[PDB]
């Protein structure tokens, strides 16, 4: 049984590396291309599953090496791939990401297959879904699947932990209401709330906004700064600070978070909120110290005894 | 285009020969007074840059005579120059050696200039080394800047050799982690580690402990002993004895050994780590057959087809 079901994206990440970015209109040689697995849903999964989770992926890839390929790496991960589908009408979603020498991107993302998981294709996962201790999803699928995905995990008790990434600015109202944990980061809270967050005092005046929409936790990521945290039972905003650490890169450093965060709520159900966001704070801050997104997120057996 | 780039120090050595050491308060004279070039990252890229490898030395000399003169050993050794920083706020690097009748010396090392190299010359040269084979860092420079230059390398890809020597006992954790190959001699493993690192059985639980700290291989040197490896996907120690041979002076034998290797991680990076080891071994051998440090390095002209 798939303790930790995760309904979202799976992303073929397509990177150059370059001297300097183009400009519109311009040819440039850059000198190393790469291909990475990303995807908020995916990346959220890996996480969980290195940390000992069973996990279920439910997705969409494209009927193409892409998908047969991200199909493998969720397979390598340990991950369920019982509900990850594939299709012939769509290429399997993709992030172009050029990047210079000083780490300024430049980023297309085509959602592709990803938008044609549909909610048929969720009605057909509807028993792993009402067996799982906590539902995993994002925006990066179509939100009337996310939604629907919601809907079920919460008609059948299950746990929502819901990453309103990337962020919409008129987000349905159905999604707060819908929440358990409501967890996202600076620029998302901006985006949601309309206020400016640029520091921790600021997270809690827009975590506030998020909770009286319907929440029941809400967690805003803050980089370096760690995250704050808000509940129903005690709504006075909490900075809970991570380690202070070198990055290497910063990349998916919230989906490691967001996946500890999923593994700490379905396997330590009687561990205090603060105390999961500690463990969840440390391990993000240990994937900022390695390079790659997935290749950056730690195994159980090279984590401190002290985080289980 | 540098395949092997190495970012470190120079430093110039002024020889006084006496018939016996001073003390203190005591002028004695001397017989003979000669200049040298040292310093590990120069060592290595001298060696790398003998066997044909194309090399560039990011660097941080003085902008007096010893830095003049070490841009010009660097050329004459075919090496590129083109990262080789100058700084009024520092002399080059330089190693005061007295030696006695006897043999015996005091040895007053400054790091100099070596410590001026800052993350802004990193960005400078950041197209040389994203665009390497493999980036080499020693720790006689300042260990931040390393630590720097070993992350810049890793996020582009770039295979990354680190030389911990001289040795530092606290040695921040994301060296290991961020080391592809971490190279080092006996002694400076006793110090990184805690054990005594006298035999190859000794050097084998070693690498471990090194293993373990997030290396994917390391390599213990073991002077006449050769050396032993480990890797990630092979954690059991192996033994490569090197060349019985009459030795006249092993200093900058491990250097011999790095530059050689760097050499074949760059140049001939589908042969097994063993072979690469048994030729880096054989090429290190040579080198402690002469005196004079960058001296008594090699030439690809000068050794057996075979190596290549
Ligand atoms: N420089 C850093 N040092 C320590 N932890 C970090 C650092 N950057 C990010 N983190 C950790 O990762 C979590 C998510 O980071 P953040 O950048 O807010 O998310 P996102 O990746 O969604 O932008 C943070 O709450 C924190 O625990
Ligand atoms: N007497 C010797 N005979 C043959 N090879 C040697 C000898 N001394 C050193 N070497 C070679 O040089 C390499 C580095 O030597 P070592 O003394 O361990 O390094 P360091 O110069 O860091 O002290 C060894 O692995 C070996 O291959
Ligand atoms: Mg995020
Ligand atoms: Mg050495
Ligand atoms: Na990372
Ligand atoms: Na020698």
Redesign the interface.
Known sequence: VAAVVVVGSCMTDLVS?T?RLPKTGETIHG??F?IGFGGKGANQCVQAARLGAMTSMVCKVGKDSFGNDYIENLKQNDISTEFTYQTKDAATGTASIIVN???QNIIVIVAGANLLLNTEDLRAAANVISRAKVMVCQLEITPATSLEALTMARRSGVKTLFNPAPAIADLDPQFYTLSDVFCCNESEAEILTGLTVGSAADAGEAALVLLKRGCQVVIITLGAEGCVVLSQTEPEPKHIPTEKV?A??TTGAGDSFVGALAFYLAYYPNLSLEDMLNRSNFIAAVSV???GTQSSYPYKKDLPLTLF
């Open positions: 590396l001297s000198h190393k790469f020498n000083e780490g070198k290497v890169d110290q390695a390079a």
